[PDB]
Paper text:
The membrane-proximal external region ([name]) of the [name]-1 gp41 fusion protein is targeted by the most broadly reactive [name]-1 neutralizing antibodies. Here, we examine the structural and molecular mechansims of neutralization by anti-[name] bnAb, [name], which was isolated from lymph-node-derived germinal center B cells of an elite controller and exhibits broad neutralization breadth. [name] engages both [name] and the transmembrane (TM) region, which together form a continuous helix in complex with [name]. The tilted TM orientation allows [name] to interact simultaneously with the peptidic component of the [name] epitope and membrane via two specific lipid binding sites of the antibody paratope.
Crystal structures of [name] were determined in complex with [name]-TM1, in complex with [name]-TM1 and phosphatidylserine (06:0 PS), and in complex with [name]-TM2 to resolutions of 3.2 Å, 3.1 Å, and 3.9 Å, respectively. Two identical complexes of [name]/[name]-TM1 were present in the asymmetric unit. [name]-TM1 residues 671–689 adopt a slightly bent helical conformation in complex with [name]. Main contacts are mediated by polar interactions, D674 to LCDR3 T94, N677 to LCDR3 H92, T676 to HCDR3 W100h, and K683 to the carbonyls of HCDR3 F100 and S100b. Furthermore, gp41 F673 inserts into a hydrophobic pocket composed of HCDR3 W100h, HCDR1 Y35, and LCDR3 W96. In addition, numerous hydrophobic contacts include long-range interactions of HCDR3 residues, F100 and W100a, to gp41 I682, I686, and M687, thereby positioning the tip of HCDR3 close to TM residues. The overall contact interface of the Fab and [name]-TM1 spans 683 Å2. The structure also reveals the presence of a Fos-Choline-12 detergent molecule; its phosphate group interacts with LCDR1 K31 and the cation of the choline inserts into a cation box (Morita et al., 2016, Roderick et al., 2002) made up of gp41 W680 and Y681 and LCDR1 Y32 and HCDR3 Y100g. From this analysis, Kds were measured to be 160.8 nM for [name] binding to [name]-TM1 in β-OG and 170.0 nM for interaction with [name]-TM1 in Fos-Choline-12, showing similar binding in both detergents. We conclude that the [name] epitope extends from [name] into the TM region.
Residue numbers in the entry:
A (entry chain B): 2 to 35, 35A, 35B, 36 to 82, 82A, 82B, 82C, 83 to 100, ...
B (entry chain A): 1 to 213
C (entry chain C): 671 to 689
Amino acid sequence: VQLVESGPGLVQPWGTLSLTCRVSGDSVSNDNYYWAWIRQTPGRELQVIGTIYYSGTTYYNPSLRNRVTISLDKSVNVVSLRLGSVSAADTAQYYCVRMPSHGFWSTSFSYWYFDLWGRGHFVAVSWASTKGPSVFPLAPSSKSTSGGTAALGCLVKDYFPEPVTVSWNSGALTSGVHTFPAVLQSSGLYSLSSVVTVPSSSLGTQTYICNVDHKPSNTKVDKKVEPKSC
Amino acid sequence: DIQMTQSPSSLSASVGDKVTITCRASQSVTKYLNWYQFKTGQAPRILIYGTYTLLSGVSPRFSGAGSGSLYTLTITNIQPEDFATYYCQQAHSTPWTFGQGTHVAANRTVAAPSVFIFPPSDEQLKSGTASVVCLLNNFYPREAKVQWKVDNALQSGNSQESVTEQDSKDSTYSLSSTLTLSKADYEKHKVYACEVTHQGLSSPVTKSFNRGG
Amino acid sequence: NWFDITNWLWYIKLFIMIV
Ligand SMILES: *[C@@H]1O[C@H](CO)[C@@H](O)[C@H](O)[C@H]1NC(C)=O
Ligand SMILES: C[N+](C)(C)CCOP(=O)(O)O
């Protein structure tokens, strides 16, 4: 059983924001399960947006009830969330979730818990328009060497909205990598850096490429990082 | 709505210690109380439902307890894979509500950071600004002081800092202090230096370059 | 809504199990 959530990265204020969760294990009309949407705001608070059943019945959190609708699309096995009149306070990670429906004679009747969670999907809500990042090398030098190992990276500067995804050597490099969290610059745009430590002997034989992705502006960038000879 | 509070908000522990997390509710929730595990990298994961019940594949180190308004999660022989943040949720009333979360991090032995410095990329100087990065790699504890000095003067609001989460195996942090400047100011000065103070360093450690040569 | 009802139903079911 797999749960893949999807939707837009950025939504305009007063718009309606739609997410879809594709359910990959069993049918949504399984009727042993309800399906639900739960969200986490920046600031770590968990809010439970909605409850639904194969029969069509829905539960909505009162603070949203005036403007949310959840529904099943049985033919393709998806569960949909629409959220209208959306504001900045709807910026959050949106999780799709499964919930056992225990029947009357079940040992565990009336026990309601969220037993399976998707990975989440982030939605920023902003008047501001999309903007891709610029990528600059952080080249290794003698100034970025300590003993036998050298440090190198690339700077991902001036982008909106969050998030950016960074990899090294197309995924083949995953040892000692540190891609930091973003920071909100004075401009109102975000920037981060991604850095890896490698053995200094390996410069001049091993190529180091960093791969940046920014899906809200359809940006993919591969920046090659060359050694300096300080 | 039933209000929920966990204690402590954050704690840190050595591998092997017993760790207990308390969850108090504004009403009685009569044992309809669930526990979840949140780690960066994976999807949130349930471990207990209805105060005491473990789900398949959750290790028996985890154990739940409680009644009335007061419940408690316990990690018995805490392991590297257990360091994460834990949430309690009440299933008693119509609008279901979670706690605020307890972040459990590792205690570890002191580790001094290795310091690196990066001047601005030629590509970036063409664009008209200049960012210089100071990197502090793989240290513990989290507290570290990073001061920037340009031709011996301290920089005020010139720089921004960022800090990774604790490494899963290393149990350590890394930190970037990036100082951002107009191409103007950067062309002005000569000697750019990054000074670091941290426990497990006896003397402050400085890394510096001269603009150009 | 049905959720809150199961809260009471549990006790109904106990009343039943006794008999
Ligand atoms: C870590 O363990 C040592 C053991 O002596 C203790 O003194 C110290 O207070 C602990 N620190 C934290 C952050 O748990
Ligand atoms: C019935 N309940 C499990 C929901 C709570 C009350 O159980 P108990 O307090 O009778 O053990």
